[PDB]
Write a protein that binds this ligand. Structure first.
Ligand SMILES: O=C(O)c1ccccc1C1c2ccc(O)cc2Oc2cc(O)ccc21
Ligand SMILES: O=C(O)c1ccccc1C1c2ccc(O)cc2Oc2cc(O)ccc21
Length: 277
């Protein structure tokens, strides 16, 4: 609805994806677009070994150090890094007044399912080991990271690990079968595309903590979020589904230039601070 949206949409077209790019071109591409994004000078970054998963603490002046979001970046389980999602991480840290742990979870096709879930559960387990309180923790992720957020909560529940206070899905990708089909292939490596921890639309969602789903009405993954909300609510999960009118896929990533992007992130901050008390 804002004019900034039309400017974002034109920019995404202007980066014409005509030739089908290799995985390496896609990684280097996304890594370059992210280095052009300025990181505010009050953002403190600390690299860490999160129990055998490489990670980075994102901290800002107003971060409460006892509140933690484990943030799982999207990129079709193929693309993305601790560098590509630092701006989203630093904005969630401000709005939610918390530390964010970004993790460099193993990517396909080099490391197929269930490697991503093994890394996300391990990093969560490591936060507990090192003194983080589940009632002051959340898991959040965008697109593939949004599906991995759900897969992680299921895998943790099934292993008897204490679940966090809340979770946040930004335009989650939870149905691997329906561009993203090829990234689905690379993640699955022959496995059934309704594998519960790969496609958590088929997972048992009972006992998950309060779940915020932010999705745009102008995105092909609208139905993933709607079906997720239905399955979660049928399983007795406290779901908040926010469909944002006319918003595109992970519009929150454009928060620097899109008022709806910064508004969505302030809402993420509110949801988290509400469930932390
Ligand atoms: O969607 C993608 O796979 C992709 C591919 C190349 C560059 C950037 C992206 C996007 C992207 C990658 C990772 C991620 O976690 C989120 C993400 O979000 C978007 C959103 C867009 O509207 C527009 C594009 C992307
Ligand atoms: O959330 C948990 O800590 C958890 C994790 C795995 C299995 C069961 C639980 C729950 C749980 C564990 C111990 C306990 O003393 C209370 C408890 O309560 C709940 C309540 C839920 O809504 C949903 C889940 C749990």
């Amino acid at each position: 609805a804002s004019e900034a949206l039309t400017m974002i949409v034109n920019l995404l077209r202007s980066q014409r994806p005509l030739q089908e790019p290799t995985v390496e071109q896609m990684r280097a591409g996304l890594e370059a677009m992210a280095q052009m994004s300025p990181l505010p000078a009050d953002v403190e970054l600390t690299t860490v070994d999160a129990g055998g998963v490489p990670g980075a603490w994102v901290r800002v002046p107003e971060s409460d150090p006892d509140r933690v979001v484990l943030y799982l970046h999207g990129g079709g389980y193929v693309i993305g890094s601790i560098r590509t999602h630092r701006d989203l991480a630093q904005r969630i840290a401000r709005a939610a007044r918390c530390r964010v742990l970004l993790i460099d979870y193993r990517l396909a096709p080099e490391h197929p399912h269930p490697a991503a879930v093994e890394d996300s559960t391990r990093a969560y387990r490591w936060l507990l080991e090192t003194g983080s309180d589940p009632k002051r923790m959340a898991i959040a992720g965008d697109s593939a990271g949004g599906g991995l957020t759900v897969a992680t909560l299921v895998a943790l529940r099934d292993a008897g690990v204490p679940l966090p206070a809340a979770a946040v899905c930004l335009s989650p990708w939870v149905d691997l079968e329906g561009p993203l089909l090829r990234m689905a292939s690379m993640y699955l490596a022959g496995q059934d595309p309704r594998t519960p921890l790969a496609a958590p639309l088929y997972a048992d969602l009972r006992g998950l903590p309060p779940l915020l789903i932010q999705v745009g009405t102008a995105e092909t993954l609208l139905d993933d979020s709607v079906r997720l909300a239905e399955r979660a609510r049928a399983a007795g999960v406290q779901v908040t589904l926010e469909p944002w009118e006319d918003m595109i896929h992970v519009w929150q990533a454009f928060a620097a230039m899109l008022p709806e992007g910064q508004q969505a992130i302030e809402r993420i901050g509110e949801f988290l601070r509400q469930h932390w008390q």
